[PDB]
Ligand binder design. Structure first.
Ligand code: ZID
Ligand code: ZID
Ligand code: ZID
Ligand code: ZID
Ligand code: NA
Ligand code: NA
Ligand code: NA
Ligand code: NA
Ligand code: NA
Ligand code: NA
Ligand code: NA
Ligand code: NA
Lengths: 268, 268, 268, 268
């Protein structure tokens, strides 16, 4: 008996086999969940990647900046899962910030249009997905988004940290709306994970100083974490998302669960 | 397949059929856990109460202010579960504050000896149980304690709120030690639950004004909670404790999980 | 000897005699500060309003969404205060959210373009003013912005609360940059103040339910505040801003000071 | 015109010329305050030390664990300042934890009697001083205590961190009582200061590993602080205490002001 047996769950945010969402989707399928996937722009690529998941799942296009995609999404999901069925879960694993808003590009030099695009994709879209999908969610359902703890400023992450602060605030409002449907809304604040993009950044893609700073941050994270932190292993994060999708945290909403090795609880 | 199948878990804090720990123990057994119980002082009473749990579990005496009890505890547990077996989980569901430290007795009028007894039982003892039991815990294990959010001052709870603030700090240090064993340490911050003691307090046992204030607090809690809060139902709390005892929050330690309906995330 | 004697301070955000910034400016002048004022759009109106301040102060136009205004601002300030002089202080008292983002208009129904405009004005602009002005600030200087505590969701404030969460994050990054100049950056989180706009909202301008909710929030604030809260009196807020502008909080930066009667420290 | 002209202020916690309280007292006198001092045990020593303050101030004995001292304190203060006069300010700069509760002595090995003594002196006593002194405080008055940010666990500080967590909670309750008198209660959370005791600890007095860890913590603090941190300079801390004693933070109570260089706002 899987943790998520018979649950119907939408998972956004797969782009590579290193996406946190890929691991969320693998774990959820291992636990009995029936999935619908959403992808942005490179659908042929995403399908090829998702062919490696343990079970079949339909893939729907979703650009969160596209109002038409959002307006049609619930109907497209219902067609995929069948009329008369609703979702039990939704995973938001979507984030973006233009290069001007991250790395060695100075914090003050990021144009607002770039920051605004990043906030749109990384924070506002959590509300936009909830608006689209709550009408097709069952009572007892769960919406989960991916977060990085923004309560203190960090090198390099710059405006992405600001976007996460906005996301945390959005989640608290989404919980008010979601509760009317009997649905929970929460974020998982993960420690650093070496996705393709993060590996590129560590390698200097957004400047050497920024890569060096991120490498220092990752090392400090494992050091501070009482149980350690493995940046090469997304499974503990995926498991935590599944815990929130399950029936086992039924009184938690508007909240943040930290899948970070405990690092945020320790100064040094 | 239960959430906790094959896990060996110690549960402290049962005194009545309304104890949060009673519900923790029922749920954990429903999920396949094999339990050892600890009780304070009234062992015949506790045995009679625990006869109503769905499965048998040995009951061991533990007064957390008694150093001899603590020194012998791991040996007594090992005898109960069998040599060569260790615990996978520990639940601390223990709290006390003398009457002078709660209710209408003025905050300033509580003698230190009373406050100190309350802190001993309610906060220090989380460290004392961990010291006793970590040497008989398996890697991957989990220690969970019960908390009430003390980040803002409240009427009536007075020095018990101070004790919880101390407990939260103790948990963060216990996580450092526990991590050396591969063990997690976390608290569950519950909303208000109408245990026998709380019902007595609402009824005026610690003064009418204090009862009135607590009644107001409970009503506000349900109002603020986006998914509501039922003070007569401990099951959602028990489920959350079981989530932390399980393998599904493997990267969370030194932390607090709020089983409170989301109330702490909303101002009004 | 005034608290701010000989300090040169820029104050943004005056639009009426009820603006928090008007009071900040009056108090700072009472304490010896020499001011430069900035205003948005209705300059003749603002001049007429500012004629009531106890001392003369030049008024410069600043629309924070106008890159040309921002690019020219330091030069315009220097002309006002004289070549070879720099500022010791900067006050950001600027906020806006379109009606779709506040009140009874549903949270989900706010278009991104509206939210983005609000975030631009209310959060990003704190970075944009700092970028413009740090090059003309003295060591030991202070940048202060106005904040409302967004750590928990509230009725009616909706996307403005999200904007404040973003502002708090921006302040922490601005402090990193400002520190290179020997300059502090902090926010003052005020309790509710009955400005003209807030009075209109309480009166129903953004819907009756929203007005009712805000009225309830204000009453709860005075109740929770251990020293009370007078929503008709901005002076305690203005004084707190002046404290941060002064030499008396020299080791505080990236931070938030709560001028709220202590309400955020109390649950009830 | 000094910041504190004509204010009558009690300052506890002087033991050496490196005590944070010595600097608080020097700065307050420089700003016009008339002081009463309290000292523990070594009164001849304290008098000799306080002879170096810029102005005369009476010294009263106060052991905060001595109920008789506390019961007589207001009468002794009134005799010192004259009948019909009251205090405007109170500074609590008192802390202690036995060696078993700090350094390399393992966290689990601290006996409760030692922890309890530390909590008594370091946390409960903030309530005990307020109880004693509020009846002789003027409206508009201010009580300030010294704090170190305990929200995350640290090496070496061990049970002292737990005591600070308790102190923060006590302050929030003291603010409720103090508000009835028109009096504010707040803490100043300082960065690390090289007092004699701290220098001894860095030098290995509580074990080499603990000294090494504290040295690492101090270095990280200056690094994280956007405006830097000088552990050899208590003046910025003293100034912040004086800001809270003044009339310039009139709407802040139950709160914590961080005089730490901004370090707590930055991850790295
Ligand atoms: N290190 C990490 O990899 C990391 C990642 N996350 C979050 O996890 C989520 C998933 O990102 P990932 O798995 O890291 O990486 P990713 O690059 O695999 O996935 C990002 C996804 O966003 C999608 N996306 C972008 N623009 C759009 C759009 N217009 N419409 C729809 N989708 C779009 C894109 O297609 C892709 O699938 C994001 O919310 C991240 O912020 C959270 C925490 C950590 C983190 O960044 C961090 C930082 C600081 N301290 C600790 C941790
Ligand atoms: N309302 C509640 O019932 C409530 C209870 N808790 C915690 O849950 C835990 C269990 O208490 P309960 O189930 O409420 O009540 P309870 O009275 O059933 O159990 C308390 C237990 O402590 C035991 N105990 C006392 N002294 C000793 C000792 N010397 N040695 C060993 N054991 C001892 C006692 O035998 C009993 O089993 C405690 O940590 C509580 O603080 C947490 C949160 C809420 C809460 O108080 C609250 C307050 C404010 N906002 C929200 C929630
Ligand atoms: N209640 C309040 O009045 C209140 C106000 N503040 C902040 O105080 C600051 C000043 O606003 P106020 O004094 O309330 O009101 P206001 O309407 O007098 O001033 C707002 C100013 O923004 C200016 N502005 C708008 N758009 C632009 C632009 N394009 N370029 C430049 N300037 C522009 C405008 O000209 C005006 O001067 C803002 O940051 C508010 O968010 C902070 C806290 C409280 C608050 O909203 C609150 C909410 C919840 N809990 C507690 C408190
Ligand atoms: N580093 C520091 O020196 C430091 C000190 N403080 C606080 O500042 C306050 C003053 O201590 P200090 O100036 O450091 O040192 P201190 O040793 O000069 O003074 C401590 C005082 O306590 C007095 N005391 C002890 N027992 C009693 C008693 N029975 N009755 C009455 N008085 C008694 C004693 O006489 C002495 O005057 C305490 O509350 C400290 O916790 C706050 C923050 C920092 C800090 O410890 C820290 C830790 C971690 N991150 C950052 C900062
Ligand atoms: Na570690
Ligand atoms: Na469910
Ligand atoms: Na509710
Ligand atoms: Na496990
Ligand atoms: Na009040
Ligand atoms: Na200065
Ligand atoms: Na620094
Ligand atoms: Na005053």
């Amino acid at each position: 008996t899987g943790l998520l047996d018979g649950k119907r769950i939408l998972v956004s945010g797969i782009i590579t086999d290193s996406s946190i969402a890929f691991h969320i989707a693998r774990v959820a399928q291992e636990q009995g969940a029936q999935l619908v996937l959403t992808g942005f722009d490179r659908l042929r690529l995403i399908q090829r990647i998702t062919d490696r998941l343990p079970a079949k799942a339909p893939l729907l296009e979703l650009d969160v900046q596209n109002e038409e995609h959002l307006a049609s999404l619930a109907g497209r999901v219902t067609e995929a899962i069948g009329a008369g069925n609703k979702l039990d879960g939704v995973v938001h694993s979507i984030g973006f910030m233009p290069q001007t808003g991250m790395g060695i590009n100075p914090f003050f030099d990021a144009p607002y249009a770039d920051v605004s695009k990043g906030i749109h994709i990384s924070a506002y879209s959590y509300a936009s997905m909830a608006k689209a999908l709550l009408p097709i969610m069952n009572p007892g359902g769960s919406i989960v988004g991916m977060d990085f703890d923004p309560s203190r400023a960090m090198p390099a992450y710059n405006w992405m940290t600001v976007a996460k602060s906005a996301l945390e605030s959005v989640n608290r409002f989404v919980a008010r709306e979601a509760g009317k449907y009997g649905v929970r809304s929460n974020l998982v604040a993960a420690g650093p994970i070496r996705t393709l993009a993060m590996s590129a950044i560590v390698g200097g893609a957004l400047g050497e100083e920024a890569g060096a700073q991120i490498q220092l941050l990752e090392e400090g994270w494992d050091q501070r974490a009482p149980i350690g932190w493995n940046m090469k292993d997304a499974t503990p994060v995926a498991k935590t998302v599944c815990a929130l999708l399950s029936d086992w945290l039924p009184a938690t909403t508007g909240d943040i669960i930290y899948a970070d090795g405990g690092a945020h609880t320790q100064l040094l």
